[PDB]
């Protein structure tokens, strides 16, 4: 038989690698996530170096408005600190850790997984996959985000290269 | 339990994601991939577009001197024809192909938004097959390899 998790991995990679842009990458990555892990949230914030913050970029589960207009400081929260790590950040409940999570409307997400983007040691962003209720995530679910988020490090190192010159 | 290539790849692109130059994530990505197919060869070749040929930029297995030597043309051999047709070249046999001591061959295009960066090659001495599941583990490894090309492109590394 097959490796059907593989072949589910293969199929977002291959959509990411032949989109087109940017913008384009980044929705399919979050809806994909989203939909084969089945999961309540999933967004991308990326590092705004312009900026110094991290900006919401794409999601499943947010109110579409948020992309684009939510962004948090370097060292904000539990996405802040996903970056300043460069570590995987898996909590099965973050209930314990909400008071100064300084998360990004009204729902309350008691999980949380946030896996750093890297390319060449520097951050690029944060994915964050969340869920109203307490939830434990296995290492394969870790593995299939670490590999997507290193697909998308150089699309968004590429993208940086060839954008505006600041 | 575990899935064997999720959890390889995991481990494969965090070593790229800590490269400190292009050339160094092509050297990770040829011992890693060699590490992970049990094969005698890896090596990757870039597209030179503007002169239609691919250049040897990293190998383990190849002899060293080959490396930033070596080129190929698109009609030249089965690297040439990965990078033509776009297509896995998948020989445990190779004899069996025209254009083909390694008797097994498998070749994957490196894509970036539907354009030929370069071909990444396994080889083998001693016939192996090459499972759908290594291709598959392939080609999401050349995925993530396409925009460290890209990005070296566009920073004028290469």
Do not use: W
């Amino acid at each position: 038989m097959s490796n059907m998790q593989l072949d589910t991995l293969r199929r977002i990679v291959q959509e990411i690698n032949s989109s087109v842009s940017l913008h384009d990458s980044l929705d399919i990555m979050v809806n994909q996530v989203a939909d084969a892990m089945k999961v309540d949230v999933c967004s991308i914030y990326l590092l705004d170096e312009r900026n110094q913050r991290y900006l919401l970029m794409a999601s499943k589960g947010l109110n579409p408005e948020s992309v684009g207009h939510v962004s948090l400081q370097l060292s904000e929260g539990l996405v802040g600190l996903v970056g300043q790590r460069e570590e995987i950040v898996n909590l099965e409940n973050a209930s314990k850790h909400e008071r100064f999570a300084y998360l990004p409307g009204e729902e309350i997400y008691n999980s949380f997984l946030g896996v750093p983007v890297m390319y060449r040691r520097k951050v690029m962003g944060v994915l964050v996959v969340q869920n109203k209720q307490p939830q434990d995530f296995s290492e394969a679910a870790e593995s299939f985000l670490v590999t997507l988020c290193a697909q998308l490090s150089g699309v968004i190192a590429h993208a940086h290269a060839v954008g505006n010159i600041d």
